[PDB]
Amino acid sequence: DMYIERAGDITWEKDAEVTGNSPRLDVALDESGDFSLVE
Amino acid sequence: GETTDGVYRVMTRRLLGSTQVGVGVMQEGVFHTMWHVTKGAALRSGEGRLDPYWGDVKQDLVSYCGPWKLDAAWDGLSEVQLLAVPPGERAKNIQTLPGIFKTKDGDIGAVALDYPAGTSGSPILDKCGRVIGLYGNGVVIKNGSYVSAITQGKRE
Numbered sequence: 064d065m066y067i068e069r070a071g072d073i074t075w076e077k078d079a080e081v082t083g084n085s086p087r088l089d090v091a092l093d094e095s096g097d098f099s100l101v102e
Numbered sequence: 103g104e105t106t107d108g109v110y111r112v113m114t115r116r117l118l119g120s121t122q123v124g125v126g127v128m129q130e131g132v133f134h135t136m137w138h139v140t141k142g143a144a145l146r147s148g149e150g151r152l153d154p155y156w157g158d159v160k161q162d163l164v165s166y167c168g169p170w171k172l173d174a175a176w177d178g179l180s181e182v183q184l185l186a187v188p189p190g191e192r193a194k195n196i197q198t199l200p201g202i203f204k205t206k207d208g209d210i211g212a213v214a215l216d217y218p219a220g221t222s223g224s225p226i227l228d229k230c231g232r233v234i235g236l237y238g239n240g241v242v243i244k245n246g247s248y249v250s251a252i253t254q255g256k257r258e
């Protein structure tokens with residue numbers, strides 16, 4: 064049995080921590096909703 | 103129960119203690135999350151109950167109490183924010199420039215941020231605060247890092 068608890072408002076935060084790269088990946092999506100890398 | 107708009111944790115008491123299995127968005131009276139978080143099961147919000155309304159394993163999305171309401175899209179140029187809600191930790195915005203998942207059915211934005219699997223369902227936002235997709239379905243690249251698609255549903 065699952066339940067939900069409020070964790071906050073959905074707002075854009077000015078001056079938030081900026082991290083992470085932008086990779087261009089060739090991918091495939093199967094019937095189970097699972098992605099895989101195309102090579 | 104609580105129907106106020108906002109980001110929510112999806113918890114369970116089936117395992118040891120209280121375990122966070124995912125996160126979701128409440129908007130216009132509809133709870134939005136990823137399919138693999140709830141498996142389409144009913145949810146509880148205090149004394150109230152949320153029943154599934156729409157779902158799809160391939161898109162990996164599910165809605166409760168009504169149809170999918172989120173329809174904002176990534177503009178393909180700007181930085182976005184992942185409003186990450188990790189297990190046992192406070193909601194925290196992380197800014198990033200998304201990459202691209204090139205598929206046979208078009209391109210989808212993708213965020214390269216690493217979080218515990220229980221962070222699945224955390225919303226990705228544009229500068230206007232609009233939910234452009236949810237985090238938690240993607241791929242693991244060669245070095246072991248995680249890249250999630252910016253998964254968005256369709257508003258009927």
Ligand SMILES: CC1(C)C(=O)Nc2ccc(C(=O)Nc3ccc4c(c3)CNC4)cc21
Pocket residue numbers: 095096097138162215216217218219221222237238239240248
């Ligand atoms: C821990 C790691 C790598 C990470 O850093 N973040 C995440 C976020 C999500 C998952 C995840 O496993 N998602 C998932 C599970 C099951 C199914 C689908 C997706 C869609 N078909 C069934 C993993 C991670």
